[PDB]
Amino acid sequence: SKGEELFTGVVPILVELDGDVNGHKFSVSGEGEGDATYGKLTLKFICTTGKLPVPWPTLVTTFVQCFSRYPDHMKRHDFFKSAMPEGYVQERTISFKDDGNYKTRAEVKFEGDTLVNRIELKGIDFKEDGNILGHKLEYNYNSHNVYITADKQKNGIKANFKIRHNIEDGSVQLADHYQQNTPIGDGPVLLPDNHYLSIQSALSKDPNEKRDHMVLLQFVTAAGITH
Ligand SMILES: [Mg+2]
Ligand SMILES: [Mg+2]
């Protein structure tokens, strides 16, 4: 299909986020590339307003599931690529257990040959010395499954999954994710059977980078449907 073909090679990615968490306003710009043939993403994010007022790991899911590797036998379930190039809206509520929540609204679409993720993020109800505003989360990331289901009335998909952020004391900060995606354009989109995405993520630092930043290497594979 038209959308699938846009992802057979390496695609440059841009990410732009504006955020307000408990009145702390910040912006992040990211760049990298995705190779959906291998489910592979490489991204570097820079906080352009100074120090990021929340922990970098809490923004990983917000900062392009069109780069998931869908096995050939699962291609009819790939909503994300099917919406391209016009793209999709991706909305989430991320609920940090016993703490605040993020509400995010993003548009993921091509600008020319570049896949862009533009995000507005609003965070409220955070505790001043909770794990988020208190920067008590380790700089690392766990592997997760994301269960995707069709959202037919929206001509899109939804998902609900749990992200676990490691706390510096050895505990875990749960971040419940609820997600809804809607296509922007008028092309035919794929409405999938229930399936999951399996995600692994590695966070690192650029040793030569003095701005506040995050380097992310991620692999995403669709699964849950046998051939
Ligand atoms: Mg810039
Ligand atoms: Mg631990």
Author numbering: 2 to 64, 68 to 231
Paper text:
Isoleucine is very similar to valine in structure and properties, and it has been reported that the A state is selectively stabilized both in the T203V and T203I variants. The yield of purified sample of the T203I/E222Q variant was 4 mg per liter of culture, one-fifth less than that of the T203V/E222Q variant. The peak wavelengths of the UV–Vis absorption spectrum at pH 7.4 are almost identical to those of the T203V/E222Q variant, indicating that the I state is also stabilized in the T203I/E222Q variant. The crystal structure of the T203I/E222Q variant was determined at 1.48 Å resolution. The distance between Nδ1 of His148 and Oη of the chromophore is 2.85 Å. Ile203 take a conformation similar to Val203 in the T203V/E222Q variant, and the interaction manner with the chromophore is also similar with the T203V/E222Q variant. Gln222 also take the same conformation as that in the variant. For the distance between Nδ1 of His148 and Oη of the chromophore, average-strength hydrogen bonds were observed in the T203V/E222Q and T203I/E222Q variants. On a plot for the two structural parameters, the three states appear in different regions. In other words, structures spectroscopically suggested to be in the I state (T203V/E222Q and T203I/E222Q) is positioned in the low right area in the plot, while those to be in the A (T203V/E222Q at pH 5.0, T203V, T203I and wild-type GFP) and B (S65T and E222Q) states are in the middle-high right and low left areas, respectively.
